[PDB]
Amino acid sequence: TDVIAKLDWSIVNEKCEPTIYHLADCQNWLPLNRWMGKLTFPQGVTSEVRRMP
Amino acid sequence: GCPYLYAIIHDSTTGTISGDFNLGVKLVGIKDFCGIGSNPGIDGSRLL
Amino acid sequence: MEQNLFALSLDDTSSVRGSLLDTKFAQTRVLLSKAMAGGDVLLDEYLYDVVNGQDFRATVAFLRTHVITGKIKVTATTNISDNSGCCLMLAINSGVRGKYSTDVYTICSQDSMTWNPGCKKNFSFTFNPNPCGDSWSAEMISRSRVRMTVICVSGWTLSPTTDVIAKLDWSIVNEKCEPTIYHLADCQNWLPLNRWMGKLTFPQGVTSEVRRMPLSIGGGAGATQAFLANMPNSWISMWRYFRGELHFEVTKMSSPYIKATVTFLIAFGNLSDAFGFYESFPHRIVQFAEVEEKCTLVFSQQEFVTAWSTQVNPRTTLEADGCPYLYAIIHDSTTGTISGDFNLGVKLVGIKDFCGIGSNPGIDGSRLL
């Protein structure tokens, strides 16, 4: 049957911190969360390979 | 001339039920990033 | 500038060392049918030939090293759904002649490896191509014609949607290669035989089930109008009687879906099939977790009053038999939500504190199981 998933929105006790992007050429760490793709591998002994830019 | 992240099947996907072996690949971040010179730009990009 | 060349980093004789990356010298692709109940020969081939195509970091150095110092690590990759079983085996042997038996009992006498891709994803181990040295070369196993094999011991309890394949990662790992020679010393600290005991088959249903295995593993195993035997088993046949601590490796080759509780023990032959009170004899009860694949059975000296005949005459009634038997009884009842059988691989790996008694004149062939 169709199913459902519940959500429990709560305001937890944690400090809210900012996440800003600089133009500093050298960065200790920079987050991008850029998706790379949905890899799809069909069954069988097919010779399979995928490239991501 | 630019690197690629490769995903190769070592052995072979399989199962006792019709289906596909999907994989979500997400680049979360770059540690010790290093940006070189300003980019003039270039319209759009490869499609995947 | 110029320089003298007779004395350069050119006469290097040292064995290949490094990471499992510079050590990978061979990758063989071996396929599996969509259906193979048992005894199928997935792939047979001389060891040295496994390199033919290959071209990895280590490949080149593999051939060109006169004397290797490390064992070979073979690693298979292959997984199948939780609701399906199967059992494979990779076994190397020093040599082969004529139309040999590809059966299981024949190949697992030397270095072998068994497993179920249904519960344990990838299997691997290390072996020594030169069974009596501590060194070996590429040209070595090529000439002495070292043959390795791959077989299916028990079919799929359920068929996969498509054919599948399992890859192999041949590497020369950093481990000392040690010999494994058989003496004629009547008293031995430990003696390995790896003599297979049989493929136990338990049909579903509440059927009253029991199986006996001869502790008189002399002469070899059965076969129509002929017996086949590996070197080890064939060798222990050298003695009349014997005894010692028995070790056993019982493997599950059926889908973890096929649940069943089996109980083992040592008892004699005259025992009825409708006995029931086996549970009054010293025993070991065996269950299998959804994943557990192997279970080791140890039977100390206290389960045998005295030594027993290595091999007894084939035409011997089951009640006239006076030599122990390894018993496998169903405690409750095999079961499942899918048609299939609960197969069990029983292999006698070795005897601790072995004791061989007097030379055996011999006796042609042997009981058939």
Side-chain angles (χ1 to χ4, degrees), chain C residues 75-200:
Chain C
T75 310
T77 329
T78 172
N79 214 184
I80 172 60
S81 286
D82 173 18
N83 72 38
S84 189
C86 170
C87 182
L88 303 314
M89 194 190 127
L90 188 311
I92 328 297
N93 290 69
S94 288
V96 284
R97 200 174 88 215
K99 303 290 185 178
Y100 49 40
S101 175
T102 63
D103 187 73
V104 65
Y105 166 67
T106 315
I107 46 184
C108 66
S109 50
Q110 216 167 321
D111 304 37
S112 81
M113 169 228 272
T114 146
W115 89 100
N116 188 311
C119 16
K120 282 177 183 172
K121 325 180 205 69
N122 62 65
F123 229 72
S124 46
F125 82 119
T126 59
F127 67 73
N128 180 182
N130 186 164
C132 57
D134 61 321
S135 50
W136 65 272
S137 81
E139 196 83 277
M140 176 81 118
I141 62 289
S142 171
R143 243 78 170 191
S144 57
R145 286 141 84 284
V146 161
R147 180 75 100 179
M148 72 78 87
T149 321
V150 173
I151 80 172
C152 170
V153 193
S154 84
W156 305 85
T157 317
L158 168 60
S159 295
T161 46
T162 328
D163 300 293
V164 290
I165 162 270
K167 197 73 77 71
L168 294 297
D169 263 1
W170 306 90
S171 309
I172 296 299
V173 303
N174 168 42
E175 276 178 47
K176 289 186 177 182
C177 286
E178 276 167 343
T180 51
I181 292 64
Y182 294 102
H183 300 76
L184 299 162
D186 297 67
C187 277
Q188 221 139 170
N189 16 58
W190 160 274
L191 140 73
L193 318 87
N194 270 284
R195 126 117 184 191
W196 180 251
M197 290 309 322
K199 185 190 182 189
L200 281 303

Side-chain angles (χ1 to χ4, degrees), chain C residues 210-224:
Chain C
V210 58
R211 282 72 205 305
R212 310 171 174 59
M213 289 157 272
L215 274 272
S216 309
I217 67 297
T224 20

